[PDB]
Symmetry: C3
Subunit: 93 residues, 3 copies
């Protein structure tokens, strides 16, 4: 279980932790053993543009739409980013 | 696609953005892959090492032949814009379900 | 050859470089070290188990892996003052590279 949010959107730590906690909760869909991270990369681009954007890699779920949807709400609401600027990737020690 | 530049070389944001723009152009030109459809990123890791040494260095992951023309063209840009030695630039071509958030 | 340590544990640079040098030695002991990258990526908001307490993810790409894993887990436990229960080690065997 691993979720990483990669984004040029800067949030305060209290708010990052809230968002990550909400995603872990999401990731009901399929625990105590799980990584999540919020990686701030100001210079991150998509579509030739450096304005607000979120890449999310989720590893290890097959269900997947319910997760993606739920996550896309969380990020759109907590990060005040346009949903057309969110990409969600699944990969399926 | 995704291009990520991973480097202990610190550049100002105006310069980072230029450099990334030049690479996207490169990928786009040399590979004929769709423009706008690419992530690029510049990840600053001051403690990044290669060869036992923390001197200036660039790792470039390209994710998802012509390939040398790209690698070459990128290696100029980084050497020129980052003022780094070309002997300290490694270019890695690297290889599931995907979604946009507008579908929701 | 690439080792990346991903952790919310903040260390001073002198100490980070030390730790990375010790790992390269490990990876080397268990080819030689001129053909390798290592990095220590500080992500303060990194969580595991629903908790932001000290933790280490290590990706090691392109290399008896147990000898490596064990030896690195000692280094990180010692140098980062972190609980071994909070350290996970991944190997990847994921394709070419091209300056000098
Ligand atoms: C169709 C496609 C495009 C792709 O390039 C990207 C990756 C991230 C964002 C993006 O806009 C394109 C990567 C992938 C991909 C991602 C992970 C593993 C294998 C392929 N697949």
């Amino acid at each position: 279980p691993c979720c990483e949010v990669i984004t040029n959107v800067n949030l305060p730590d209290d708010n990052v932790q809230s968002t990550l906690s909400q995603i872990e909760n999401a990731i009901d869909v399929m625990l105590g053993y799980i990584m999540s991270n919020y990686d701030y990369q100001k210079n991150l681009r998509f579509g030739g543009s450096n304005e607000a954007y979120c890449f999310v890699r989720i590893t290890s779920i097959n269900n997947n739409s319910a997760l993606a949807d739920q996550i896309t709400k969380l990020l759109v609401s907590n990060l005040n980013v346009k949903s057309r600027r969110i990409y969600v990737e699944f990969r399926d020690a």
